[PDB]
Design an enzyme around this catalytic site. Structure first.
Site, PDB file in Angstrom:
ATOM      1  CB  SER A  31      -0.967  -0.109   1.177  1.00  0.00           C
ATOM      2  OG  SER A  31      -1.994   0.858   1.074  1.00  0.00           O
ATOM      3  CG  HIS A  42      -4.137  -1.835  -2.070  1.00  0.00           C
ATOM      4  ND1 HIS A  42      -5.235  -1.325  -1.411  1.00  0.00           N
ATOM      5  CD2 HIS A  42      -3.088  -1.681  -1.229  1.00  0.00           C
ATOM      6  CE1 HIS A  42      -4.866  -0.889  -0.219  1.00  0.00           C
ATOM      7  NE2 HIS A  42      -3.568  -1.093  -0.084  1.00  0.00           N
TER       8      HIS A  42
END
Lengths: 192, 94, 191, 193, 186, 190, 191, 191
Positions: free
Chosen positions: F94, F119
């Site tokens: 992330s 993501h």
């Protein structure tokens, strides 16, 4: 817990906590679960010791039930990267990633104490599998890749076939120090 | 202090001649020495010795410059920082 | 708790009272045996061997028990290091605490007169959930530990394995005199 | 709590102590609050330390405790009896249960209480739970009875009384003033000034 | 809380202890009472003759803990002067009144409250156990009223009336009652 | 945890992390929070002062965290003069993967068995209140989503369309896959 | 929170930033007024009087209120000690915080331009349970406190007791200008 | 968190890294604005003015918002002290964090390129329970605060009060460029 203070005699005196005193002797402890924080301290100590003396062995004492795979891999890659050999010793237990890091020690320098317990097994959840079936598929695939990676690296450490580690890590596989030596997780068992 | 021990008590000092640097032998046995100074930290030591007392029930607690110096003893000068071997060579404390 | 500070005469060095007693080669195991409390004992045992391998180490035990693997890290360290580890029971030595008490150097295992020593088979070394296959594995591991502890106890006490199997079936409480007769300790201190 | 810092005067300089370390320097050991493995082991560590500083001088063991673990209290008790220096005991506020036991365990003739202190003696409660099977409950009931007898026997010895007297008097919580504790035999003197 | 440092470097409470000021702030517990006792013992030795100033801002607390302070105050040689700041309630009022006669003070807007004790401990178990604890509580009640009456130069009967329910007093009322001797202004 | 103390010969006693900061090593371990991000920023600012020319080594072992907290690190990395080399230990997921890719091009590293995951963002904050408030927060989240994909695409030398596909659901990559993708430049072995 | 360390030039002395400001005779009352936070203010006020009985003490207040008895320990200490205690409102001075603000030396009570000052009758000084006789007692004590606070407020503000009784009936929020007009503060600082 | 220690060359002085940056006149406001975090900022601002009244102070803001009264203690301190307070937005400046960002010295308000700045009307400054009379009072106080904040924002931004009233009605998120165009910041830093 209260960590005792010990005095080092030198050229004067220096007061250490007993773990900093043992770090001065190139002893790094991994005690309890492997977490981002406990793994990063091991990495920091391994990096520090390489700089102090790149040629001398580092002694990595393991008494751990397991923990995070990514945290254990930060230790694992640091052990393999740094120039000095990292000798590993199992105290009490080396289970899951603790057994992985034990087997990851320099070949010929992986030790266990006589009544230690070594346990190897396939990983559990590396993270929850919620959300949508598409998300669950992704996390299931990532867990299988980790499973294969760990068995492959274990098989390399133990000089065994990948097929053997796949059988033997299916369910919790507890081993005595002698069984771990025969398996290939450790090289020697210390007595005195 | 150690070097002075044998100068205050009778020795034979070997000192340069009256010219530039044969040395002269001087017997210091009969030379009178008067030493002195402001032992600034000496009152606290005398108060610690004369007002020790104690803390806690069973123990008993004791009551609390001119007066203190007037009662100075070698024990204070030793704790102050003079060596017993030099104190004994200064028998008169005024 | 506030741990008192004491001054060692040498100049002066200020210690907490436990670091001061470590300087005298006294290692305390107080309360439950955990990975953290066991590793401190190991660190102290290692440290003391380096300071002086020939002098005895005094291992004072006041513990209800704890983890077997944690206790085994102490046990193997005691047996490995060159200096004899003398053990003393204060208050109580129960379960792994009694095991480590009996693990002291033969002839140097002590108890205080009103101490309580209790030996028993292990309980859960970890939960037994999951599938019957997982429960079988953990039941087998617990039985191996049970046999290992009774075997090592029997060795410590100069008794038959059959005697320890009877006597550790249920919590077996012993006075210092009974522990001496049993073979867990060698002497009882008075003064 | 913030523990005050006090300065001890030595030669031309000062050592800073917390006030409890300062009182330990005077051979005063405090047992305050419940008797636990940790609080009992600190008392033992202090008693051992003081014996070595001076095996001949008295140790002053100040007790303000509602009781606690028997095994923890016994670690103190055996240390008190073992070490060479006399351990004088003083009751501040209260000495109840194992606190009263340790108070009575002081050196005979040197057991003290303050005038308004409260001393309470009683048979032990649970030394540990009694669950499991009736066989396990039998074992723990037997161990508790042995402890009960041991404590009454040692109390009777401390107080110069018959075991039968302590068995009556410890049946239920027996509260005593300092005067009643002196008459009973738990303490020797009551301090005023 | 961060305790300021004042100039050797002291925390501000250790600095005030150097001036023979002992604080009892908040509830009276075994731990807070033993610190007061440790400070009182320490100060007696530093100087057995000089007064000790015992500043009280407390709602009350344990009786046995308060009695450890009380007996220490009476035992040690130096007079213990007591000052009420904010409030002295229950055992706090008892310890306030326990100061050396003539040296018990209160600040002008302080609040002093005296009352019979509450539970010194729960009363469970069997009726025989409840009887014992009820008797012990009554003995404590009588002891506290008797010592209060002595402090205040009043009859025991007066303290028994006045401590029946929470009796709040201004500094002036506490002075008239006999709990304090003087009220400070400047 | 007890952080070991080490002695530097020059003696000066350090905790082992202050000792490694002396060598220009900054750790981001665990979740990215305002507090952990501000320590990284404080260390990055401090190191620029000590030597504006020498590289800074930013070791990342993080599952992700707050976007705004990660952006405080990101902008500090780009602002300060010295190159910030980034290394992935264990994982960079992330915002941890974002900061990994944000290292100086040519100096982004990963260890061989590290795991890198990219993501789209999740909730940057809850979406309660009225539909008007939910609309606002949904719009802000979409702007953040686009900003992160755009900056990722820049880091990786890829099209924005590629990052939009690949960040739709958690995209786990080995160090080799991250190198091929463009998140890192090299994989260290010895 | 991590309290910064600052260096005072004299040699050098390292302070935490609040001890450094105490050296300048600045005492902070931040957050609720409790026995512990009030006693620190008292300890600082007493300490500063000893350091210099003549110099002003600066009492910075950013507080929503708190215990009345705790606030009264500060209040009586402020009035007792010889040096003037100047008071400054930062952020807010509400309830006992407003009382202590108004309690500063007349002519030296300050507020910052956007500060908020709120005065109100006291709430529960303690619960009112038990029997109706106990509730009567606590209700009477609360009314006496209410009257005492309004009376002292009226004195501080040079207003009639009747004015404070109206104005403290419900939470009365004031800007710095309104507090100045009311009589709670003397000046408003800008630069 | 463990705050690193750094060594300043002068002899040597060891600082925690935040005390080291305070030595460079950098004050951090990180996380929610509370009485305690706001008072540390005030203490640091006061301290830095004493060290050098002429040099700029750098106030780094990474904050989601917080208490209005706590933020106002910072705000009034910033405006009061002689040295200019430059403000920088790191990560985010939301609610009172955006207010304090805009409160920096005009021409010295900065934001980093990917920072997020959000302005909005205040929420509850405290609960609104009790009686309808109490709720009326607290509703009126909240409206006065709302107007005060919009008025001060409009002053900071060189905009009409009517513009801030529209734009703060609901959470108004801005990029650094939008905040610059709006008037909350003066410049955007890159290198």
């Amino acid at each position: 817990y209260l960590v005792p203070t010990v005095i080092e005699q030198s050229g004067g005196e220096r007061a250490f906590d007993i773990y900093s005193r043992l770090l001065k002797e190139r002893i790094v402890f991994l005690v309890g679960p492997v977490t981002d924080e406990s793994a990063n301290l091991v990495v920091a100590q391994l990096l520090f010791l390489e700089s102090e003396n790149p040629d001398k062995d580092i002694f990595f004492y393991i008494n751990s039930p397991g923990g995070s795979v990514t945290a254990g891999m930060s230790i694992y890659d640091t052990m393999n990267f740094i120039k000095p050999d990292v000798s590993t010793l199992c105290l009490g237990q080396a289970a899951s990633m603790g057994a992985f890091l034990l087997s990851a020690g320099e070949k010929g320098k992986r030790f266990a104490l006589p009544n230690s317990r070594i346990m190897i097994h396939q990983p559990l959840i590396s993270g929850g599998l919620g959300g949508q079936a598409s998300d669950i598929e992704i996390h299931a695939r990532e867990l299988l890749k980790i499973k294969e990676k760990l068995n492959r690296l274990m098989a390399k450490h133990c000089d065994r076939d990948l097929a053997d580690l796949e059988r033997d890590t299916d369910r919790d596989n507890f081993m005595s120090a002698e069984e771990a030596k025969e398996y290939g997780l450790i090289d020697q068992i210390l007595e005195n | 202090q150690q070097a002075l021990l044998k100068l205050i008590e009778g020795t034979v000092a070997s000192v340069p001649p009256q010219g530039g640097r044969e040395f002269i032998n001087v017997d210091t046995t009969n030379i009178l020495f008067i030493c002195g100074g402001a032992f600034a930290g000496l009152e606290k030591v005398i108060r610690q010795r004369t007002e020790k007392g104690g803390i806690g029930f069973g123990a008993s607690v004791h009551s609390k410059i001119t007066k203190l110096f007037g009662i100075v003893e070698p024990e204070d000068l030793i704790k102050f920082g003079l060596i017993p071997e030099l104190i004994g060579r200064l028998p008169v404390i005024a």
